[PDB]
Coordinates of C-alpha atoms in Angstrom, one line a residue:
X1 CA -1.9 9.5 -12.4
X2 CA -0.4 8.6 -15.8
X3 CA -2.9 6.5 -17.7
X4 CA -2.6 3.9 -20.6
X5 CA -5.1 4.8 -23.4
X6 CA -7.2 1.8 -22.2
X7 CA -7.4 3.4 -18.8
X8 CA -8.5 6.7 -20.3
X9 CA -11.1 4.8 -22.4
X10 CA -12.6 3.0 -19.4
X11 CA -12.6 6.1 -17.1
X12 CA -14.2 8.2 -19.8
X13 CA -16.8 5.6 -20.5
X14 CA -17.8 5.4 -16.8
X15 CA -17.5 9.1 -15.9
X16 CA -20.0 11.1 -13.8
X17 CA -21.7 13.1 -16.6
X18 CA -24.9 11.2 -17.6
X19 CA -25.6 7.5 -17.0
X20 CA -25.8 6.6 -20.7
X21 CA -22.7 4.9 -22.1
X22 CA -21.6 5.6 -25.7
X23 CA -21.8 2.7 -28.2
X24 CA -18.3 3.8 -29.4
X25 CA -16.9 3.1 -25.9
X26 CA -18.7 -0.2 -25.4
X27 CA -17.4 -1.7 -28.8
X28 CA -13.9 -0.6 -28.1
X29 CA -13.9 -1.9 -24.5
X30 CA -15.2 -5.3 -25.7
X31 CA -12.5 -5.5 -28.4
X32 CA -9.9 -4.5 -25.9
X33 CA -11.0 -7.2 -23.4
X34 CA -9.3 -9.8 -25.6
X35 CA -5.9 -8.1 -24.9
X36 CA -4.3 -9.3 -21.6
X37 CA -2.9 -5.9 -20.4
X38 CA -6.1 -4.1 -21.4
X39 CA -8.4 -6.7 -19.7
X40 CA -6.8 -6.2 -16.3
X41 CA -6.8 -2.4 -16.6
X42 CA -10.5 -2.5 -17.7
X43 CA -11.6 -4.9 -15.0
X44 CA -9.7 -3.1 -12.2
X45 CA -11.2 0.4 -13.1
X46 CA -14.6 -1.2 -13.4
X47 CA -14.2 -2.7 -9.9
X48 CA -13.2 0.7 -8.5
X49 CA -16.2 2.4 -10.1
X50 CA -18.6 -0.3 -8.7
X51 CA -17.3 0.4 -5.3
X52 CA -18.0 4.2 -5.4
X53 CA -20.2 6.1 -3.0
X54 CA -23.9 6.8 -3.5
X55 CA -23.3 10.4 -4.7
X56 CA -21.4 8.9 -7.6
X57 CA -24.1 6.4 -8.5
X58 CA -23.5 7.2 -12.2
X59 CA -20.1 5.6 -11.9
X60 CA -21.8 2.4 -10.6
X61 CA -24.6 2.4 -13.2
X62 CA -22.2 2.9 -16.1
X63 CA -19.7 0.3 -14.9
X64 CA -22.6 -2.2 -14.7
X65 CA -23.6 -1.2 -18.3
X66 CA -20.0 -1.8 -19.4
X67 CA -19.9 -5.2 -17.6
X68 CA -23.2 -6.3 -19.2
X69 CA -21.8 -5.5 -22.7
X70 CA -18.5 -7.2 -21.9
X71 CA -20.1 -10.6 -20.9
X72 CA -22.3 -10.4 -23.9
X73 CA -19.6 -9.3 -26.5
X74 CA -16.2 -9.5 -24.8
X75 CA -13.6 -12.1 -23.8
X76 CA -14.7 -15.2 -21.8
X77 CA -12.4 -13.8 -19.2
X78 CA -15.0 -11.1 -18.5
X79 CA -17.5 -13.8 -17.5
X80 CA -14.8 -15.4 -15.3
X81 CA -14.1 -12.1 -13.6
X82 CA -17.8 -11.5 -12.8
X83 CA -18.2 -14.9 -11.2
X84 CA -15.1 -14.4 -9.1
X85 CA -16.3 -10.9 -8.1
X86 CA -20.1 -11.5 -8.0
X87 CA -20.5 -10.2 -4.4
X88 CA -20.2 -6.5 -5.3
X89 CA -22.6 -7.0 -8.2
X90 CA -25.2 -8.9 -6.1
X91 CA -25.1 -6.3 -3.3
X92 CA -26.0 -3.6 -5.8
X93 CA -29.3 -5.3 -6.5
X94 CA -30.4 -3.4 -3.4
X95 CA -28.4 -0.2 -3.9
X96 CA -30.5 2.9 -2.9
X97 CA -30.2 6.6 -3.7
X98 CA -32.6 9.5 -3.8
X99 CA -31.1 12.6 -5.3
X100 CA -31.5 16.2 -4.3
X101 CA -34.6 16.5 -6.5
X102 CA -36.3 13.5 -4.7
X103 CA -35.8 11.2 -7.7
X104 CA -35.1 7.5 -7.1
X105 CA -31.9 7.2 -9.1
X106 CA -30.9 4.0 -7.3
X107 CA -33.5 2.0 -9.2
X108 CA -31.2 2.5 -12.3
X109 CA -28.3 0.7 -10.4
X110 CA -30.7 -1.9 -9.0
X111 CA -32.2 -2.9 -12.4
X112 CA -28.7 -3.1 -14.1
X113 CA -27.4 -5.2 -11.2
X114 CA -30.5 -7.5 -11.3
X115 CA -30.2 -7.9 -15.1
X116 CA -26.5 -8.8 -14.8
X117 CA -27.0 -11.4 -12.1
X118 CA -30.1 -12.9 -13.8
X119 CA -28.1 -13.2 -17.0
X120 CA -25.1 -14.8 -15.1
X121 CA -27.5 -17.4 -13.6
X122 CA -29.0 -18.1 -17.0
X123 CA -26.3 -20.1 -18.8
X124 CA -28.6 -21.1 -21.6
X125 CA -29.3 -17.4 -22.4
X126 CA -25.7 -16.1 -21.9
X127 CA -24.3 -19.0 -24.0
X128 CA -26.7 -18.3 -26.9
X129 CA -26.1 -14.5 -26.7
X130 CA -22.3 -15.1 -26.8
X131 CA -22.6 -17.6 -29.7
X132 CA -24.7 -15.1 -31.5
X133 CA -22.5 -12.1 -30.7
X134 CA -19.0 -13.6 -30.9
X135 CA -17.7 -15.0 -34.3
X136 CA -16.5 -17.7 -33.8
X137 CA -16.5 -18.0 -30.0

């Protein structure tokens, strides 16, 4: 316990309410990724969320949404981190979860993981997104 404001930001942005991440949160997390202390707290909490159990699949989905935004709008260090920690992302391409209503929620995790890894393989695409999004990279 005892959180920096960045830690509260990233936790709130990846919490187990609904899988949709606020635009507010994403913009602030991308801005904060350029700060050294913030970057590590952001990436470490994101790693924890990704590693959560199936019941908390919303933690995983939202973490992946945050990671996608970060590599598209955040510090180059976010891309670096992903490549160093690609394994957890890649395994999530096959994550599975059916909820108590019989709904395939795991497909949400799988699509986000598959998008992120596809993007990370597509240097042309990621480079142009980042040039476009980041003034002046």
